[PDB]
Structure formats: structure tokens, C-alpha cells
Design a protein around this nucleic acid. Structure first.
Length: 92
RNA sequence: GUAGCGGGCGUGGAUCCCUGGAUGUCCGAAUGGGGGAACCCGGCCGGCGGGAACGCCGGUCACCGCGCUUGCGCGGGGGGAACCUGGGGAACUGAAACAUCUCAGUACCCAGAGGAGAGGAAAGAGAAAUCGACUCCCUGAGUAGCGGCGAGCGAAAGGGGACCAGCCUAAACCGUCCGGCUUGUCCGGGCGGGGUCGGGGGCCCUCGGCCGAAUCCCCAGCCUAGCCGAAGCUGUUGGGAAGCAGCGCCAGAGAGGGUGAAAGCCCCGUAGGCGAAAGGUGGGGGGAUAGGUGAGGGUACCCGAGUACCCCGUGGUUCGUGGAGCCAUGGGGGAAUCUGGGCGGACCACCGCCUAAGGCUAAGUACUCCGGGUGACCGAUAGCGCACCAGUACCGUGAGGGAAAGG
RNA sequence: GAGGCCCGAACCGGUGGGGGAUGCAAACCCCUCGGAUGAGCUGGGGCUAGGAGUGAAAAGCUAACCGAGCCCGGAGAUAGC
RNA sequence: CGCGAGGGCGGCUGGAGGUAAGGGAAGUGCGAAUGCCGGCAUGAGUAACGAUAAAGAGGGUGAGAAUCCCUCUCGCCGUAAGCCCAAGGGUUCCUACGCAAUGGUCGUCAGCGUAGGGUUAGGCGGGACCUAAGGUGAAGCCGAAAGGCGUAGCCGAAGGGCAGCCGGUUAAUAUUCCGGCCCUUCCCGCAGGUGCGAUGGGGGGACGCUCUAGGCUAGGGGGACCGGAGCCAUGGACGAGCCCGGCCAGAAGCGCAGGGUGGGAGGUAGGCAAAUCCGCCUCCCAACAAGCUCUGCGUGGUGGGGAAGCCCGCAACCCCCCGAAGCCAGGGAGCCAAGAAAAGCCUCUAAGCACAACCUGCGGGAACCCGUACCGCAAACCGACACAGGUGGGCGGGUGCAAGAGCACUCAGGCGCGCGGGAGAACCCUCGCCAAGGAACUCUGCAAGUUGGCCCCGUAACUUCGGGAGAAGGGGUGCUCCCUGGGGUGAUGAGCCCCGGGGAGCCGCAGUGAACAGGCUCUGGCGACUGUUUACCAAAAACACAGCUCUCUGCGAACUCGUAAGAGGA
């Protein structure tokens, strides 16, 4: 119950654009989302996170019913000045 | 739930089916506190990240009722289709108006009980040299009665059946521990022993002989998966044989469904017969604890109190004020302990019945959320509101209303 | 520089007329009108209920028909029509 | 073949059930119940297509367009028909594909269909802060059960309280991301200082309406001045022309406006005796201040932004004037109806502790949860609809008119209302005009007209004396030129605005030349008056109203609600 926080890297133009500097966001855990997911990502990608931000989401979809995904909380960790590493050049 | 990629696992016995276990976010009796259910915020102990601020992680903290010196240990709370008991408790209607009466102690509301609930071992019944807890059914009986004697309401005993079961206490009397007091060989609180009645029990002397749980146990048996199960070929028309035609065969199995059309013998089955490591259940038959086991003779110590009883006000019963008891009981008065007290329809007197004011008690009875089996039951405008992704869509602030649609 | 003062926007209202009448609308539009520092208007948060509430009082209002709301139930009320 | 209800036969269709004689059972026979459910008709190619703000054309794309994109014209809003915020709504946001249906037409389009994106906060708004009404509710009171009151406590906001301004970024977010400048809390270490220390005491927080002063700022108007690519048209103008732009934020420190506040020194029956803190008494000084505090505004190191202009892309920033409803703010004056609470915040001592703890500094650190798309006077909310209706707050430019949020035109910005095309009848709606006459109309001058603003004359009865008063009834208003009186800021002189006054003279039918914009009088009834009322036929002479009278009520009041407790009265 220590990694079940970071879920998947997010992938959108906006997502990648981030790489430039302040890292990108990964879909985190709805709750326990605690912006304190810093000593969470830095224990997985081994780095210094200097700032965190968070959001929410998921829409509907049709046919016979509705309601999509969840309402995933999610958002970018800034990472120290320069250490920005791994997964960067990966996928673009 | 198939359709698809994309990957994989199985006789090294998968998937599946039964049994037990594990994990089980958050809200909900909801129980750390809050709150606009599913969210927000905290105490205390411990552990994570460099961790002091921050943040996660695991425990743990509601309140109420009973029993031990302060902490504790047992319990409660909410839900459930009906069925059940109690506490409250209508009107429409009927009376061809309406007020008594009726509907009706019904509808509903509330509390509570549980696989049932209730009731239950006589202060009974009622005329029988009588009967012998209670409940249920059939009668008795639309009788007896009740009733603006209208409308209408309506027993009980007795007789058939189902079931079958009986039991503890309070008080005399003895012992013991404790805290109060007028430090009196006394008062009452708690345990133990005794004692449970149509007549008995206590206490003194005289004579001493066993049945049996409603509670604990064990196995059977029965649920909760399964396994075995007989007997048919050829030809022929047909899109398709189970039809038709010719020879058979099984049968404790000729119930049923299914297979391209109408099959006992093709498939699943059916008759019949086997199966449980595990968990439920389980006197039906048996083991063991609990507990219970006699007869006379004497005092004249006990036998359930604001009770009986009488009176005023009411309720229940067939009983509506009636000649109106009995059973309940709000108010007032207020006893006795077997030379006691209640009842047998005012009241007396006879004659007889029964032992009030403490409690428990199986079964036979009721119901159908749930599982199975049948139907001179429906077959999609029917049958449940739903055969289908329905208490949905849609409607309504809300309570609530509530479809259509199968091949 | 006073005022239940005056004219007049906003804002509140609803006088008269026309139109509308299977409407733009289950009360509307146009012109014209009343009030407009007050017994004013208005947002937000609260409280009062069915023989009851509220009512500067019309039996008015209480979720588009109120001389007794709506829903479910008694219920297949009763109907000499 | 049966009298008939029906019963057989035959032919096409259909493709899997059916059911004799003779009998038995019923949910057993439909044309009507304004029956119920479904389907389909008639009216009918008829009415309508939802505001009379308005359209046209050229290019594009495309199977196909009046209806989609682009361009140029025209028109309509402009206290909006424009921007920003709440609520509510929940992806309607942006992008790529699409048109069956949904759009009252069309559809290449969309708020529609499929898919993928998008919402980033210590300082914004909420919560780990405060209380209001009122809820809830340990105790406690009361009720047949449900349950009713209710102390403390808790909950409860648009009210109190608390630290971010200016730019830049994306298709879609931004006070959230980025830059610049500026802050707030917690924690730790260090240095230097003090009696430290509450849920308890005190102060404070802290308040009405109307009217107002002085300074500011927002906002807006000028310029002969600053810098500008440029343009001379159509008769003239090479002009001190025309045209565009002439700011924003910003610490400490400076200035300018304010708001707060007496300083002492002793006593003390109070603040549930604990305070050297309040509160009260006493007396040296002091006083329409100073000082000390605390705001706002300028200024500020500095950063930011920066048009019109052709090809397809150039770099100032000053000077006056008007000027708030906003700010300094808890300012002032006046009045009667006499105008929240609590916390944060100061201060005072208690327990306890002083090796704690606080206070100021400086450095390092730490800083969670929720909201953030988009619509938002509307086609995204409430009205069954893409409904001419309903919906709280802020901003809301310019000129002109006495003023203004009015009226007319117009900036920015946004719209031309999701059917069109022709005709050019009756009739209907809405609108303009009319000879002569002027209420003859009609229930009625209903309706429509006339009048309309401002300045100056001038105005009766009656009166409660305020008022009848805009009584009535008149005259003036435009434009040019001349002289002249005071004002505000400058500075006392100049521009700049602000109110006047006096003479001439010009033109038209007409000078508030358009739009906003009273017709009046005499006399009765009723009701004093402003008010209120039947949401959706009655706005009144009805209700109310100050005011008068009768009457109940001595306080555990009477009276009302409730079974009661209890509450209202108060």
C-alpha cells in the first residue's frame, strides 16, 4: 500500500509540453491524493520534488447506460531544478 | 452475459459445483466529533518519508441496562413478506333520515416477541353420585341470550378429534456474612438450607422403601456437491426422420425435455441403488447429570396487602342499566391466615366447588420473504406493475405515481 | 435642509383601452396609468400546516381550480340516479 | 347440409400442431357504456413556422447550400441585445471526424452523433477560525407509546476575522502555470531581551437613519505640447492640417491628506476580593495640540505594456480641466423609531513554571482538504418547447438637452431574432393625413387628439393657515458679432472650466426646429390623508390608519398556543 498512489503517466500534448521543465502529471489515487504524494513519487523515480498540484475528472458515455471512468484526481510534480529524468524522451 | 482483438491456463488434473477460512474502501443501528448518507475534522499509543512542523499507516475512543471500589465483564440499539401480543384507535357505510346501536376493537399508529407469538396447571367450570392446565379443528348453535327487543350481534357447558407436561418460588424455621442503631442477645439488607398446598408446610417425639429431565452429551437419520443406471438395425419419401414399411429388443425404466418433423431402446433423464473429508440439523432409539422418593401423634408458628372486601367512575363477556353476578380497575374506605378467603347470575340461608393478591412451561396452532412439487391456471391488451437491463423510463418539490417493449 | 412632501428613471405595481383567445404566454404584448426615504423594494439563512397556519380581511394565500391542500390507506364508501 | 346460430366441400396461404363419438367444466359469444388500450382516418396540403432590428452581392468548401466559411456593403442594440460575479445547470468547453434523428425550412452547420483532449492556488472562495436567527442536544422537566420542551456543549453565513498586485502564456485554465516586485502562518537553530503563563477578569471588536466638510483616486474631456507610418481625393486646403497613440504595477524611505488617543502620582465597600488590569473617587501639570500609533494617496530602485500605418509585420509615454455614490472612515452635524453576537486582537493576574515559557532579530526549513471547463437577463437556470414571460450583485464610454442611470445618435463589444420568394384584392392588426363642421358619437368624449422642457411675468374663491399653485392666462427660446460683472485651479496675469448681464444683426412656415415632454376649469357624492386588497374578471365609497370610547387585567396579570412541561404576553 505504498505505490498504489501513482497510477499511470498522463499523455496529452499538454502533458508532454510539461517535460520542458516542471515534470508532467500522472493519474494519482482519487483520495489519499494528499498533495503529500511527493514523498511518494520521489521514492519511486528517485528525485527531489519541489511542488505539487492536483485536479479531478471523468465524463459520461452512451448506449444502454452512461457514467465513465471515475473522477481520477491527477497532477504534475515539479521535480528539482534539472534532475527531470526518465520517461522524458520516452513517447516524445 | 462472446463479438473483437491482446495475451494466457489446463489429465504435472484447470475451469466449474459443495464446505470452511481469508481479504473485505466508504455510508447505513453507525457507535471519536461533525454532517446537507456515502464527505469533513480530531484525542491517546505505535510505525513509516530526510521528518520538527506536513502527510499518510495500524489500534483504539457512542450512549443505555444489568452484576465486582472505580476499572471493569456480560447485554442492548437496526432490519424482516405475512403471521403474533400489547398500548392507542376512526369514518364512510347499515339502521332505506339519525343521535343509542352498526361498521368494529376493523383501518391505521406505536411498542414488543420469534420461528412462531399467545395461552397454560384451577380462588376454574356448572348441576352432572360430575369434569379436571392450555391451545387448535368438528359439533353444540344461529341454540342460549343481547338489542331505539330496530337494524343487527351472538356465546358457554357438554360430545367428538389433534396434541399431551408438568413445574419453581414468597412466608414459618436454622445457619452465615455485612451496615446501622437508643451498645438491647434487636432491627432489616444479601446469600445457603428448608418449603410449595385442597389442604399443605414449620417446629417437636414415633415407624424409612426410587422414578426422571423441557438441560448436557454420543451415534443413527436427514440437509448442504455428486455417481451408477436396461434395450435398434435396415430400407424409404423428405430440406431435415424420431414418420412410413420390415424384422427386433429393454422394462422395478412406456414421467418429461431435447435432437432439422410424431423416438421406451439417439442425448439428458426416468424406475431402482449407491455417496461426504467438511458444516449444519438431529431423543426418532439409546447413555449421563439436575431434581424428585414414606406413614401417625401434639402446639394451635407460615401460607403472597394498600390486596381481598364495600362504595363511586368504567372496560371485557351474548349482557346496550337490566333482577346484573363474575373477570378486569382510576378514586375513596380498608381486613383476615384455615373458627381463614373467593365462586355456583341481586340478597339471605342451606348444599357443593376452588384456594386470589409471585414466576416458568414443550406440543398440537398461524403465516409464506425463502426451496421443491403439482394444476378440467394465464399464455404477452393475459399472467405479477415488470417473460425484455422495471419499481426502470417518464411524472411529481415531496410523500408518491408509474409505462411500453417477447418469437 | 425637515417630510408615510412633489415631478420623474431604476425598482415595485397593475388604472383605462386595443391586441392576444388551438396564445409568445395555463394571465402575455403595446400604449396609458399608481408608488418611488417608506406602513419601501430586494438577496441569502431561518420559523408557522390542513378545521391547522398566515391573513392592512377577499373566505384571500398555503407548489398553475382551496367555504377546508396534496399523497396513500378504510375503498370495490354509498348512489331509491 | 341446417328454419337459424352454425356445420361440411373445394381452391390459394400457412408450416406444427390438432383433437371424434359420448360426456364433464367454465374468466364462454360485444355495436353502442362521452367505455379502456392500440392503429389509422376527417378537417388539410388548410392554420401555423414564436416578436416588423433588414437585408444584398462576390468568392470558398461541397453529392447537394437563400440557410456553412470568408470578404465588401446595409441595418439593430450600446444604464444593452456589451463586459464581470452569484445561483442553478452538469461537459453544454476545445479539437477531428460526421448528418439518420434533434433544429418548426435547409443544412456541408450546431449547444446534435462518435472519439480525444481540457479545469493546476499557503495569499481567490470555502474547511483544520468566530458567532446570528434557528437547529441539535449530555443534564433537567413533561408526555399512553411515538414523542414535546431544554442548560451546557455543538451546528449554523452572503455577517466578523485572515496574507497578491502587474504582465505573459494555451485550441481549451489562470490572482492557480511563468516573470517581476510584495506578503502569511506553523517548525528548528542562533543572538539579544522580559515574570512567563487561560476556555477565567477587563478593554476592544461595536454598528441606526438623513444631511454633510477637506483632501484624494477611479473615471472622463482637452492640448497650440511628444512620437508617429503615412493621406491631399471631388472645387479649395502643402495647413500651428488630417490621422493614430500619448499609460500600468511597484517595497523600505520620503513627502500630503486623514482616523485613533490626554500624561501623572496615590488611594479603593466592585468586576462572584486572585490582578500592579478595568471601574470608581483625590490633586501637580496638559488642554480649540504635540507626541505617539494606524490607514489612504502621491513618489518611489525597478519591471511591464506600448496604434494607426502598405509589403506582409514600425517603438513615445508630458501639461492643464472636470471629477465621484469609491477612499482616508471608527470624519462631522441633526433627528427619534434609539440602532447583533462571538472569535481573532491587547492587557491582568490563577493554578503551575521559571534548565520552562514568552518578545524582537536573522538564517534553514514546513505549508494539507474542497471549488476552479462552459452557460449565466438566457437556446445551457425556472417556465413540457431553441416558449415575445420570470431571475440577485458589480462595470456600464462619447456628444447634445437645465439635470440625470432620461431621450437621440454612436465607441468597445455584440447582434439582423433557424423558412423563404412574389404579388400589391376584400378584411384584420399597427401607423400617418384629411375639406367644412366640431361631441352632433356614445351608457360615457371610451379612444384619439390638443398641452407638453427650462427662464420671466402673472395668478381667485376657500383654507386646518402648510396649502389650494404647474391655479388660471401669457411672453421668451435658434445663429452671428460687440462690451461687461463675479466664481473654482493656477499664481494674484495666461490658458482651463463655472454661473450671469447688457446692445446690435442674420435666416426660415416653424429655434425645447428631431426624441424624452401636463390639456384646463366650475360644481356634487364617498372616503380625511400616504397606504392595503380579491396571484388568474372586482383596487373601491371595502381593509388599514393616527384618534375617541367601553371593557378585562395587581403580575405566577388578563389573553393565546400546548394533554403536559412550557412558551408568547414581557
Amino acid at each position: 500500500t505504498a505505490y498504489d498512489v501513482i497510477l499511470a503517466p498522463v499523455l496529452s500534448e499538454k502533458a508532454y509540453a510539461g517535460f520542458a521543465e516542471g515534470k508532467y502529471t500522472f493519474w494519482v489515487h482519487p483520495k489519499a491524493t494528499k498533495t503529500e504524494i511527493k514523498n511518494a513519487v520521489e521514492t519511486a523515480f528517485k528525485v527531489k520534488v519541489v511542488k505539487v498540484n492536483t485536479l479531478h475528472v471523468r465524463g459520461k458515455k452512451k448506449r444502454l447506460g452512461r457514467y465513465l471512468g471515475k473522477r481520477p484526481d491527477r497532477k504534475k510534480a515539479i521535480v528539482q531544478v534539472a534532475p527531470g529524468q526518465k520517461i522524458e524522451a520516452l513517447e516524445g
